[PDB]
Amino acid sequence: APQQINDIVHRTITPLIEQQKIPGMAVAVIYQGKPYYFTWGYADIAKKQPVTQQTLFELGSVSKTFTGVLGGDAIARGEIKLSDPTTKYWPELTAKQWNGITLLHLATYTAGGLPLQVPDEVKSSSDLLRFYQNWQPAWAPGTQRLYANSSIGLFGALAVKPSGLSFEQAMQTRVFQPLKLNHTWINVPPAEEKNYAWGYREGKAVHVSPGALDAEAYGVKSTIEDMARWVQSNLKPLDINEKTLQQGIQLAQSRYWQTGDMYQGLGWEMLDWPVNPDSIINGSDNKIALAARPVKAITPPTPAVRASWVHKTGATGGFGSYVAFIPEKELGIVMLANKNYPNPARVDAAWQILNALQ
Numbered sequence: 001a002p003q004q005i006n007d008i009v010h011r012t013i014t015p016l017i018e019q020q021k022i023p024g025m026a027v028a029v030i031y032q033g034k035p036y037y038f039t040w041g042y043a044d045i046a047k048k049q050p051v052t053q054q055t056l057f058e059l060g061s062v063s064k065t066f067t068g069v070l071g072g073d074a075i076a077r078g079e080i081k082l083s084d085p086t087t088k089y090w091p092e093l094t095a096k097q098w099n100g101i102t103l104l105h106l107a108t109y110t111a112g113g114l115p116l117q118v119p120d121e122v123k124s125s126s127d128l129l130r131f132y133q134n135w136q137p138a139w140a141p142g143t144q145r146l147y148a149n150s151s152i153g154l155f156g157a158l159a160v161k162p163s164g165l166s167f168e169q170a171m172q173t174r175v176f177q178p179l180k181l182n183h184t185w186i187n188v189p190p191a192e193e194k195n196y197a198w199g200y201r202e203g204k205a206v207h208v209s210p211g212a213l214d215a216e217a218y219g220v221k222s223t224i225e226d227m228a229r230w231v232q233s234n235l236k237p238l239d240i241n242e243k244t245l246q247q248g249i250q251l252a253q254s255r256y257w258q259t260g261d262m263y264q265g266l267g268w269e270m271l272d273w274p275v276n277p278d279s280i281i282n283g284s285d286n287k288i289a290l291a292a293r294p295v296k297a298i299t300p301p302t303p304a305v306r307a308s309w310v311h312k313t314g315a316t317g318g319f320g321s322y323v324a325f326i327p328e329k330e331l332g333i334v335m336l337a338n339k340n341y342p343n344p345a346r347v348d349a350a351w352q353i354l355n356a357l358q
């Protein structure tokens with residue numbers, strides 16, 4: 001790598017790893033469109049396996065960016081519309097609270113207080129219908145944002161229904177394959193298990209557990225190389241040959257709602273660039289187990305703004321991920337770690353690196 005990138009990345013990430021006691025980490029910087037990779041530590045402490053450019057990490061909620069783009073692609077194909085009622089795609093959802101809840105609301109956490117998690121007790125499909133039928137919104141649709149796997153997860157499941165493909169099949173054929181993300185998985189195949197890092201939670205090796213709507217909300221695993229390619233694709237969607245996918249990427253970066261200085265896309269979240277670092281650093285803090293915020297509708301949504309800090313944090317029990325990029329500057333970063341360490345430390349490190357390179 002150019003010495004500037006080497007120095008900025010190492011001076012930022014080495015202390016982060018020490019302070020957060022991260023077992024293993026991979027970073028990619030995209031600078032003027034090209035990727036530069038860095039790795040530290042261990043994918044598997046007990047077996048002494050190092051992190052490499054081929055190591056798979058759990059992306060956790062960064063998976064929502066893939067869901068948002070897959071949904072965008074389904075819109076571009078004419079299979080769904082975000083203005084469609086949820087009940088168009090799930091007629092069995094007859095309970096009256098669903099009146100007025102659209103796919104847009106599901107995709108952007110604005111349905112009226114769908115919960116962060118689908119309950120663990122929900123295992124069967126009939127359990128899932130029961131859960132959504134019985135859910136009582138706290139708020140009218142389109143008035144408050146409450147980040148929720150049960151919301152965007154349902155969006156992803158419904159978005160692929162008209163295609164007749166499973167969510168995984170749709171993701172593979174419509175997103176992963178065209179973008180050449182050949183080491184990106186919803187279910188890690190046996191052939192790739194040697195590369196699947198362990199996550200570490202309180203010193204114990206852990207992988208994400210199966211759950212309802214997992215694939216749709218938090219279920220992608222990927223390498224640092226594929227994630228750099230994902231950032232490149234989202235930085236420059238016009239280079240993508242597949243028309244509906246190019247369009248879907250753009251739709252996912254549209255600004256649908258505003259809360260504070262943040263704009264909600266499909267999976268992606270955005271701020272105007274230049275950003276107040278304190279605003280993204282502090283704003284990334286989970287606070288917080290539940291953070292209900294009034295939203296303002298952006299009517300109609302603003303098409304993808306190039307002068308944006310576009311980002312997403314992700315976690316599973318054992319992993320912590322972060323992706324951020326600035327389309328106007330052809331600049332981006334991916335940070336994958338096998339410990340779920342605090343979001344503000346992720347965002348602070350990413351901002352230090354990108355600000356130094358911008």
Ligand SMILES: Cc1onc(-c2ccccc2Cl)c1C(=O)NCC(=O)O
Binds near residue numbers: 116117149315317318
């Ligand atoms: C934030 C956030 O958004 N989704 C998850 C999540 C991921 C996998 C399983 C369950 C959840 Cl809620 C999560 C988070 O904080 N995950 C950490 C964890 O699962 O321990």
